[PDB]
Short mmCIF file of N, CA and C in Angstrom, two decimals:
data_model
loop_
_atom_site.label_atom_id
_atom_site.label_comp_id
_atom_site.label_asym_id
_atom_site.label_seq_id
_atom_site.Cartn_x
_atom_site.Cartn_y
_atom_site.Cartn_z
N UNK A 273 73.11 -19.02 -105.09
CA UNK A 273 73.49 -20.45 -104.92
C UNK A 273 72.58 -21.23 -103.95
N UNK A 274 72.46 -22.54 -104.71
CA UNK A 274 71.71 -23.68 -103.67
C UNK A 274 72.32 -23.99 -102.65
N UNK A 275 71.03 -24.41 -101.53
CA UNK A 275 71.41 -24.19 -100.02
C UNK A 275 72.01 -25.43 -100.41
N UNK A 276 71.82 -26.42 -101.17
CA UNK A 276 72.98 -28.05 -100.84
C UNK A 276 74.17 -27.49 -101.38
N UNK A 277 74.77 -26.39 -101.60
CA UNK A 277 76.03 -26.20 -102.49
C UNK A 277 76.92 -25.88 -100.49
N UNK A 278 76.40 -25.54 -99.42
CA UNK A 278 77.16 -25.37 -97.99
C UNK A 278 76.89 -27.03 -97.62
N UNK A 279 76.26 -27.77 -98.17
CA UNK A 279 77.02 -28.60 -97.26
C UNK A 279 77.90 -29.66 -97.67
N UNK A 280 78.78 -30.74 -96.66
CA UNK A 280 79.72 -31.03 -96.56
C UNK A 280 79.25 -32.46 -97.65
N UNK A 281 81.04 -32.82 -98.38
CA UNK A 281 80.80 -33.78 -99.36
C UNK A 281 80.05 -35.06 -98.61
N UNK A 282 79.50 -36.05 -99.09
CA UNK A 282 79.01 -37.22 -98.43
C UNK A 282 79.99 -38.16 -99.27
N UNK A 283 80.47 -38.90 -98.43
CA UNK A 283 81.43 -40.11 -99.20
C UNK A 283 79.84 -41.44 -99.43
N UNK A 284 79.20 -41.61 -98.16
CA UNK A 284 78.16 -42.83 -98.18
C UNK A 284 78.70 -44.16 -97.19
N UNK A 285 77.52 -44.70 -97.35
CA UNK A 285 78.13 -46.06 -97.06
C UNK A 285 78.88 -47.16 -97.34
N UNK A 286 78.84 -46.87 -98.92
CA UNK A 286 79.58 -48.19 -100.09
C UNK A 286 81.09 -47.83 -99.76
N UNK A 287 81.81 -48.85 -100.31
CA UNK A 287 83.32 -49.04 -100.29
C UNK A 287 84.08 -48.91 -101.72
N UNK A 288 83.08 -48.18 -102.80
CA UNK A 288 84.36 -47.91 -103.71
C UNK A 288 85.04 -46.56 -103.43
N UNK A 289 85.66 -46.56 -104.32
CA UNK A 289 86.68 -44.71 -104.23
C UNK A 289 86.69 -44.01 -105.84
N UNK A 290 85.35 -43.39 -105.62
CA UNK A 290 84.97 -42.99 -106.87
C UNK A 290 85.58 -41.20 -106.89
N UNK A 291 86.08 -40.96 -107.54
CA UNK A 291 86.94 -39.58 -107.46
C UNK A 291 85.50 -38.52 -107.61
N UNK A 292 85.54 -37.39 -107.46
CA UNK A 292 84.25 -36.74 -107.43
C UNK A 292 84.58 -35.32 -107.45
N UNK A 293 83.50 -34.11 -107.58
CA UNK A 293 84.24 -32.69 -107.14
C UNK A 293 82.95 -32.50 -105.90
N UNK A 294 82.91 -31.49 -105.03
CA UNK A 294 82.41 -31.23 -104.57
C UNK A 294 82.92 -29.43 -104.27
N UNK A 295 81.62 -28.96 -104.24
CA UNK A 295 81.92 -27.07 -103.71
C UNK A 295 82.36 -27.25 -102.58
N UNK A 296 83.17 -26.66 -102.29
CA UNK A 296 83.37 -26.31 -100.93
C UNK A 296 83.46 -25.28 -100.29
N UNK A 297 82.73 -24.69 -99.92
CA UNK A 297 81.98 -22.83 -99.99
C UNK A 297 83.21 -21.65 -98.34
N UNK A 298 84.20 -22.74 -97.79
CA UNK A 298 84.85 -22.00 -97.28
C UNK A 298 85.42 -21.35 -98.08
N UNK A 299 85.89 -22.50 -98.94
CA UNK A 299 87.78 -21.92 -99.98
C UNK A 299 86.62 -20.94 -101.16
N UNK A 300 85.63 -21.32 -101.57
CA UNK A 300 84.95 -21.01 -102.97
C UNK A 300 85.51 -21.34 -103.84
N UNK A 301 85.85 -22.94 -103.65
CA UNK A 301 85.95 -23.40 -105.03
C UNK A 301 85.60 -25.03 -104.80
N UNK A 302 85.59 -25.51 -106.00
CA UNK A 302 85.40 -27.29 -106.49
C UNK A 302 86.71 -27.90 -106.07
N UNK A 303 86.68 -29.03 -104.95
CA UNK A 303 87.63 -29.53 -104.70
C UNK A 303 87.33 -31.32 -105.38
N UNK A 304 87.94 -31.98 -104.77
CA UNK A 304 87.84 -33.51 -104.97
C UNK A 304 87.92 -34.34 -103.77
N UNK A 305 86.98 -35.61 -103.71
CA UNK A 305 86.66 -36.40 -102.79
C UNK A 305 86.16 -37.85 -102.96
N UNK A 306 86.26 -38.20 -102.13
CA UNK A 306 86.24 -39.59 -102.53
C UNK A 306 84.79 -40.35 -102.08
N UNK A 307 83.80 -40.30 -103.43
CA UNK A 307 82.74 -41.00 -103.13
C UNK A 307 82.84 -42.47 -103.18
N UNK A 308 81.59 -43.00 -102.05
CA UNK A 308 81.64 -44.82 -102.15
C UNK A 308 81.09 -45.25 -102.91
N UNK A 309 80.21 -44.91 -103.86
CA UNK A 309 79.54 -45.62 -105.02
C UNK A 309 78.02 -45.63 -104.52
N UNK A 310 77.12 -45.36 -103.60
CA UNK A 310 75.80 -44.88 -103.65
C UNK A 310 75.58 -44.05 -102.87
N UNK A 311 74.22 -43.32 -102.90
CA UNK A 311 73.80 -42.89 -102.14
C UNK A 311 74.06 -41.31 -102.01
N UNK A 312 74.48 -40.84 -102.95
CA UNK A 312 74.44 -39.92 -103.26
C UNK A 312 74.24 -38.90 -102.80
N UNK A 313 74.51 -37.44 -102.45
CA UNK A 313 74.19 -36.14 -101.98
C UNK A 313 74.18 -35.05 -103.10
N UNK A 314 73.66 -33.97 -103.38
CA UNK A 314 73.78 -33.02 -104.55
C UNK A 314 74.82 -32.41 -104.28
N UNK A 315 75.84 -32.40 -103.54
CA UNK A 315 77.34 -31.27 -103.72
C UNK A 315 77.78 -32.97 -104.04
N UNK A 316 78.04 -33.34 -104.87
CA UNK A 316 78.53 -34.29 -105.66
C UNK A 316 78.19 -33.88 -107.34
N UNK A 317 79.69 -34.14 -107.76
CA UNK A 317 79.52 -33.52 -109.55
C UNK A 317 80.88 -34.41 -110.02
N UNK A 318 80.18 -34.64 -111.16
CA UNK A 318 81.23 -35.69 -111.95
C UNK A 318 82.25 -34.43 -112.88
N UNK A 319 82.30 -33.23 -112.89
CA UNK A 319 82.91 -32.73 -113.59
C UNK A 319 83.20 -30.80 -112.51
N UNK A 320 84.45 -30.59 -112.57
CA UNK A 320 84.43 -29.53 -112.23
C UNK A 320 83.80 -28.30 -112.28
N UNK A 321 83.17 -28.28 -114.11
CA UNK A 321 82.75 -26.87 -114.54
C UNK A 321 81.38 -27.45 -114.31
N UNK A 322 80.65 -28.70 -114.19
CA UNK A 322 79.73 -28.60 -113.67
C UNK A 322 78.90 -28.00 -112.61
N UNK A 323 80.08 -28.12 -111.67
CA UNK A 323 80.50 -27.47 -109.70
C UNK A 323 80.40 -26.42 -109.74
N UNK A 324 80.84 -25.70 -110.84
CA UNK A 324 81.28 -24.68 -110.69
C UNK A 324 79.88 -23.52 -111.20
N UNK A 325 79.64 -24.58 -112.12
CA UNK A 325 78.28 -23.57 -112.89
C UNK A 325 77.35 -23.77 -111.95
N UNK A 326 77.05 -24.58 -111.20
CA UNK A 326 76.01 -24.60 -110.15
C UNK A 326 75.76 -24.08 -108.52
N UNK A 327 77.76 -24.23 -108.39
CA UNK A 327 77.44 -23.44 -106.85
C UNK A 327 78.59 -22.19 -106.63
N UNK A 328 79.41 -21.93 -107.59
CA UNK A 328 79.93 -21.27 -107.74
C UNK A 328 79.69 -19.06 -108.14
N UNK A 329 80.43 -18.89 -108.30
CA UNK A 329 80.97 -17.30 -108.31
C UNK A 329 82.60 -16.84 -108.54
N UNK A 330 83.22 -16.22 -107.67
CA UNK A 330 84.57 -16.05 -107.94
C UNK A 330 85.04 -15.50 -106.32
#
């Protein structure tokens, strides 16, 4: 797994509340968070099994 899959979700600077998954490598699994609409970080995924195929295991 990619070293961006440890770090922490980035919400950003913008003010929407865009629903999102992000890894979260304590629990080892895809949780959900609330992105602002830019600015982006790579532990950001519009789909769970996306999350999952990329920073995941079991």
């Amino acid at each position: 797994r990619p070293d961006f899959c440890l770090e922490p979700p980035y919400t950003g600077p913008c003010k929407a509340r865009i629903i999102r998954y992000f890894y979260n490598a304590k629990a080892g699994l895809c949780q959900t968070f609330v992105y602002g609409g830019c600015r982006a970080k790579r532990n950001n995924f519009k789909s769970a099994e996306d999350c999952m195929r990329t920073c995941g295991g079991a």
